[PDB]
Design a protein around this nucleic acid. Structure first.
Lengths: 108, 89, 66, 1030
RNA sequence: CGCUUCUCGGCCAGUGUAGUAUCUGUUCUUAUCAGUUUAAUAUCUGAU
RNA sequence: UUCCUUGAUGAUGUCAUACUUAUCCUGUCCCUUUUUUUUCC
């Protein structure tokens, strides 16, 4: 019962440049536990933020009600974040240690 | 994107569709048909049996060359079976 | 054009252009029966020794490159 | 939603569940033996990779011949660093013992991935003995987000409530709340912007929500949103922006680009068009960048390869085009070293596609380049999945390269045999399948190359159950045509059994197969007629001819074919006899099928066989079908036409019933069906004639004549058509609506705007104004002229085509001066009008009475100051000489001075078009002796040589080529000497391009015309021969 | 309904692919040398 | 023996308008058909 494209990430915009993690964490806090957040602190990305939850259906409830929701005088653009794309700045890796670990304790 | 195959010139008579029908192939023209078209069955085979030497439809006739391209002797170069520079199908 | 020999380009060296026209001179001389016979008469040999000689001089003419 | 209605008829998804992983894709000499123990050792150190080692040793069998290129290919596959080390050490041990007688990283990441899936799947294997939602790490999170974001904390009390959130998501999901509004100098207009941004796309073009300058790279990214002007906006924007990016190729470099496309060519919401365009950008920049794309290549295919698997054909052909352009564009060893690891990738999809990739890259770089690689793969002993792939590869190679596979056939096969015996099934399956495809390109040939294949195959045939079984057939069937009908004889006789027993399966893969087989088995010269008549037919018509089949597409065709060939053998009446009775079965597609089948058969075999009674059943049928047509379709119509034209005067008793229906239908039934019956007349004209049923010709002539007042276009069109074909049978002076009535009756129609009308009309008018043409008093004609003239607004070619040819026909009827004077009316002030086809009138006209008349009018009319009509007259000469040929030996003089003026500038166009005149003249005159002048003109031509303007140049190339044949080389070459070595580049560029064009033709002539050239120190440039004097 | 007489009226702003041409606006003639570059310039690349 | 105004380019700009290819405006669907072999006198 869900469209496949939407993901635990949301792109979130129309923010002020004063605005508070306190406000943020609270408001978004409704739908579910926050995996974490990012805020564009940079010359371009000042004004926008990413939000990610421990579940999608969390976020679903989010983009549902928070759609066009208000803060200050602004309306927040509320979008399911794309993915893939430019990440590979971070190389795939970090297996070896870990998968040896599951290899070890559980022996499995 | 659209250019010749120029594979070797066999004995296979050329085949043209409705659309292309009048055209002397390289001079693009209707003028003075005289002499006849040959292409490689490599170019011309199977689903290409009687296929257009241009568009990919069934051949209803046989391209004749102009005289213009004749005295400039171009008809004797590699077989003018146009390949889209994707595959030929 | 490229796979058709004797093609030039603007980087064409003196030497190459001339060696070209040498060779082509030759496949003409093998070609045109008479012209050949002409040579044969002048410098006295066989027709053959002519053609043979020529087909020696084919790769060389002018001598080594630069 | 309604917007979801009219927006969905914009675009649409098209795709299966299966193809939707796409969303999941995240972006990017016995000591030769014991030697193999060595090589294996050292590389294994530098674990376990197989087909590498095999691409290495796979250079053995050319023995003595292996070289540097080993370092090339291997150089990419391993890190080009270790490369030198190894292949150097090898070349040493090889020469000696010859006497004395990121990539690696990447694969590491793969073996990672599946080791992981093993850990989890096993965790629910012992957990079941006990996805996208999988939790995340901060190392992982930073990589996914681009650069340039802070993570936060609001508070450990804040993030504590967050930690409390879930537990308090159920907890405070069940607790108190509701929300209350209260009844009671704004600002902040958000900038959402520059042609337009869909809502979703914000995510990409977000940085065009900022408005700044002074940032440098970021000014290149922020300038590359020129895309959006590609993706959305107006057509002209798309155009201009598009070039602006093309010439900016070299500059920004691939890296930034593909960084900024592949998101979009990945866009979950992408269109059709937007897709296709963004492909266009990928090709176009790939005409440029070559060495550049290397690091991006895989990072391209990942998007593209899905293109291969598309419902849209034109999609595919684009895809292939660019995968070549890439693969050839990049290097071979690039392509390989790139694309191993997708072979063993868990998903069958990515394999599948990965093959078709290798198919394409192979069409690019030739098989034999790539063989030792493949041949390595199919001998990979790690796992089969590869081999399943590598074999597939063989196939799609087969399909693509097709008829050209021929030479390496033997090698390819020599790969694939080692499959058929395999323990795993699929590998058998696919394998054989390939053999099939091969043979289907090997038609007919290379039989014994397949040779060593058979004897398993035949045996395999026996023992099988299932899809594989019929596959092996798919092969054998495509073999048999390749055998000797004595050997083929035997082997055939074995198969036709299993074929029998197998008609009946429910499998459709099956029925396709066994079907196409019969085409071949009993599709043979060396097979006996009766035998088919007995064993096969009755089954055949039984199980196959059924309504399952024809509803599907392919099966429809393949069927028709097959049945046809059983006709080509056992005769006609046999088949047709059994399927006649089904024209009267209700459902269409079925009927359509029987109908076309018959049509062909009496196409090939001829009517002559058919008996009588059966025939009554035909025509009764072919009406009964024809009377009920869901759409109007060519099928029943043609199928009929052929029926009649085959039956010839056997047909005659049947007319009255025909033409009876022809009329009855013709009327009513409201107009949609009308055009059909009309055509029906169109095609059966000839039959109504020779039999001499004239009362019929009274009927048709006149009653059609009435409809010509019909207002629907799509009737009137077919109506005229009928008239035309009616004219081609009964001559003019016997026409029952005698032309005087008719031809004017047509005349006013020519406004009709709608297509099919303008076509059949001008066609008709043409025939009649050609043939009779006396019947109609001149005045009427000149009305026709002044009506034709604007038929030259036709979007279409064919209309203008016959249009012109008519213009001529009447121009004959009357006489020239006027009709060109009238054509001469088109003017330079407009343009689109009298664009050229009019000129073509001036030409054809100028033939059809002695042009020797017309020139002075024309020439003089180049005086007029209006520029574009000037150039018009120039082309007039162009087509003019092209159409006259020899005759030019006269009026040449007339034009020559004019060519001098026009050829001297006003503007380019003068020089372009005029020069073309020089061409067609220069050919036409050939070798009658008028050169002198043509030499003269050559001058005023010559300087034009230099320009970038593509039309001007390819024009000039036209000129000098022709002029060569007219003047001869020697003169030409005497313009082209000085140019060759001229210091500058610019000139040498060209004078070379010319001298080539001179050179290829008439190379044989030249020899004479190379001048003497003084011999230097190291060399002799004087050809001493010619000076031998007797 | 037919015939006769009288009165009135009628007719002889299409679309798509490739490509060139031509105006105007804006910036530079401005310090030396070293490399790239050009037919030669120009242009581009460094430091006082 | 004691003296005027001027021409021109090149480069960078998404302004403007003419125009060129018998281009283009209808052809066109056909081997994408992919799965851990598994259709019973």
């Amino acid at each position: 019962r869900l469209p496949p494209e939407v993901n635990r990430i949301l792109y979130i915009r129309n923010l002020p440049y004063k605005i508070t993690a306190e406000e943020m964490y609270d408001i978004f806090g409704k739908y579910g536990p926050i995996r974490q957040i990012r805020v564009g602190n940079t010359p371009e990305t000042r004004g926008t933020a990413y939000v990610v939850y421990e579940d999608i259906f969390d976020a679903k409830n989010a983009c549902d009600h928070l759609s066009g929701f208000n803060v200050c005088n602004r309306y927040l653009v509320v979008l399911y974040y794309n993915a893939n794309r430019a990440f590979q700045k971070m190389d795939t890796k970090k297996k070896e240690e870990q998968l040896k670990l599951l290899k070890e304790k559980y022996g499995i | 994107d659209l250019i010749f195959c120029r594979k070797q010139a066999g004995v296979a008579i050329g085949r043209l569709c409705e659309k292309c029908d009048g055209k002397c192939v390289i001079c693009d023209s209707y003028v003075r048909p005289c002499t006849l078209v040959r292409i490689c069955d490599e170019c011309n085979y199977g689903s290409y049996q009687g296929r257009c030497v241009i568009c990919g439809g069934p051949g209803v006739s046989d391209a004749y060359y102009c005289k213009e391209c004749t005295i400039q002797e171009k008809d004797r170069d590699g077989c003018p079976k146009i390949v889209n520079l994707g595959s030929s199908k | 054009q490229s796979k058709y020999i004797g093609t030039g380009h603007a980087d064409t060296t003196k030497w190459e252009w001339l060696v070209n026209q040498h060779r082509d001179s030759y496949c003409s001389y093998m070609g045109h029966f008479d012209l050949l016979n002409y040579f044969a008469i002048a410098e006295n040999e066989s027709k053959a020794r002519v053609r043979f000689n020529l087909m020696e001089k084919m790769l060389q003419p002018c001598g080594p490159p630069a | 939603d309604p917007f979801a209605e009219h927006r969905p008829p914009k675009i649409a998804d098209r795709e299966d569940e299966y193809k939707k992983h796409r969303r999941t894709m995240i972006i990017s000499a016995e000591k030769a033996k014991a030697g193999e123990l060595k090589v294996v050792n050292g590389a294994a150190a530098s674990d376990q990779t197989p087909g590498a080692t095999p691409k290495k040793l796979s250079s053995w069998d050319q023995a003595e011949t292996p070289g540097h290129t080993p370092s090339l290919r291997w150089d990419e596959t391993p890190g080009r660093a270790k490369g030198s080390e190894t292949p150097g050490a090898t070349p040493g041990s090889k020469i000696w013992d010859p006497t004395p007688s990121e990539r690696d990283t990447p694969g590491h990441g793969s073996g990672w991935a599946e080791t992981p899936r093993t850990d989890r799947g096993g965790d629910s294997i012992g957990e079941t003995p006990t996805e996208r939602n999988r939790p995340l790490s901060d190392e992982e999170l930073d990589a996914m987000f681009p650069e340039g974001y802070k993570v936060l904390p609001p508070p450990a009390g804040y993030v504590p409530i967050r930690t409390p959130a879930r537990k308090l998501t159920a907890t405070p999901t069940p607790l108190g709340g509701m929300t209350g509004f209260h009844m009671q100098k704004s600002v902040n207009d958000q900038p959402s912007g520059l042609p337009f941004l869909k809502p979703d796309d914000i995510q990409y073009f977000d940085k065009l929500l900022v408005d700044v300058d002074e940032s440098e790279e970021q000014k290149e990214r922020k300038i590359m949103k020129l895309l959006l002007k590609i993706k959305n906006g107006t057509p002209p924007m798309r155009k201009a922006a598009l070039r602006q990016i093309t010439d900016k190729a070299r500059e920004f470099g691939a890296g930034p680009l593909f960084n900024q496309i592949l998101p979009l060519l990945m866009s979950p919401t992408l269109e059709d068009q937007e897709r296709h365009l963004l492909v266009k950008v990928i090709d176009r920049i790939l005409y440029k960048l070559d060495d550049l794309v290397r690091p991006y290549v895989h990072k391209i295919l990942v998007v593209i390869e899905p293109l291969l698997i598309d419902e849209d054909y034109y999609a595919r052909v684009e895809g292939r085009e660019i995968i070549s352009n890439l693969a050839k564009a990049a290097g071979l060893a690039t392509m390989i070293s790139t694309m191993r690891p997708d072979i063993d990738n868990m998903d069958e999809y990515v394999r599948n596609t990965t093959a078709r990739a290798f198919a394409v890259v192979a069409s690019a770089l030739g098989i034999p380049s790539l063989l030792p690689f493949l041949k390595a793969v199919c001998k990979s002993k790690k796992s089969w999945q590869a081999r399943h792939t590598g074999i597939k590869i063989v196939q799609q190679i087969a399909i693509l390269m097709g008829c050209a596979i021929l030479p390496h056939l033997r090698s390819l096969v020599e790969i694939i045999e080692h499959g058929l015996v395999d323990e795993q099934q699929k590998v058998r399956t696919i394998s054989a399948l390939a053999i099939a495809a091969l043979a289907e390109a090997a038609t007919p040939y290379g039989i014994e190359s397949f040779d060593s294949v058979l004897k398993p195959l035949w045996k395999g045939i026996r023992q099988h159950r299932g899809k594989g079984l019929a596959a092996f057939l798919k092969a054998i069937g495509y073999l048999i045509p390749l055998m000797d009908a004595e050997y083929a004889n035997y082997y055939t006789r074995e198969v036709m059994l299993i074929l029998i027993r197998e008609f009946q399966s429910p499998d459709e893969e099956m029925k396709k197969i066994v079907l196409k087989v019969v085409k071949q088995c009993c599709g043979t010269d060396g097979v006996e007629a009766n035998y088919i008549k007995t064993e096969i037919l009755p089954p055949f018509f039984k199980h196959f001819w059924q309504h399952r089949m024809a509803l599907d597409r392919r099966n429809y065709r393949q069927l028709v074919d097959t049945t046809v060939e059983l006709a080509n053998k056992v005769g006609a009446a046999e088949i047709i006899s059994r399927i006649v009775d089904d024209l009267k079965d209700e459902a269409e597609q079925y009927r359509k099928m029987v109908m076309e089948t018959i049509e062909k058969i009496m196409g090939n075999l001829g009517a002559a066989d058919i008996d009588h009674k059966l025939e009554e059943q035909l025509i009764d049928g072919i009406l009964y079908a024809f009377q009920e047509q869901t759409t109007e379709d060519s099928v029943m119509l043609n199928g009929f036409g052929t029926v009649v034209n085959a039956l010839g005067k056997r047909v005659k008793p049947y007319l009255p019933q025909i033409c009876g229906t022809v009329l009855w239908r013709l009327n009513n039934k409201s107009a949609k069906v009308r055009q059909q019956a009309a055509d029906l007349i169109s095609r059966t004209a000839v039959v109504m004639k020779t039999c001499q049923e004239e009362k019929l010709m009274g009927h048709l002539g006149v009653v059609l004549y009435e409809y010509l007042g019909e207002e629907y276009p799509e009737v009137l069109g077919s109506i005229l058509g009928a008239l035309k074909a009616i004219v081609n049978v009964i001559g003019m002076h016997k026409m029952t609506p005698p032309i005087k009535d008719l031809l004017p009756r047509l005349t006013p129609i020519l406004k009709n705007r709608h297509e099919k009308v303008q076509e059949n009309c001008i066609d008709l008018v043409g025939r009649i104004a050609d043939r009779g043409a006396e019947y109609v008093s001149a005045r009427e004609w000149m009305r026709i002229c002044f009506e034709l003239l604007e038929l030259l607004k036709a979007h279409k070619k064919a209309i203008r085509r016959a249009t012109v040819n008519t213009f001529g026909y009447i121009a004959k009827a009357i006489g020239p001066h006027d009709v060109l004077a009238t054509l001469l009316n088109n003017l330079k002030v407009q343009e689109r009008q009298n664009r050229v086809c009019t000129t073509v009138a001036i030409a054809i006209v100028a033939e059809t009475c002695s042009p020797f008349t017309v020139l002075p009018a024309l020439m003089n009319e180049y005086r007029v100051p209006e520029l574009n009509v000037q150039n018009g007259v120039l082309k007039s000469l162009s087509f003019l000489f092209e159409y006259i040929g020899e005759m030019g030996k006269d009026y040449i003089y007339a034009v020559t001075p004019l060519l001098e003026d026009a050829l001297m500038d006003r503007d380019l166009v003068h020089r372009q078009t005029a020069s073309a005149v020089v061409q067609h003249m220069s050919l036409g005159v050939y070798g009658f002796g008028c050169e002198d002048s043509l030499n003269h003109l050559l001058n005023y031509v010559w300087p034009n040589v230099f320009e970038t303007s593509p039309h001007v140049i390819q024009a000039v190339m036209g000129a000098l080529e022709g002029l060569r044949v007219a003047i001869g080389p020697c003169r030409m070459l005497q313009y082209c000497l000085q140019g060759l070595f001229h210091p500058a580049r610019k000139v040498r560029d060209v004078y070379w391009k010319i001298y080539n064009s001179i050179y290829i033709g008439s190379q044989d002539a030249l020899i004479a015309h190379y001048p003497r050239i003084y011999n230097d120190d190291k060399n002799t440039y004087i050809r001493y021969e010619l000076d031998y004097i007797l």
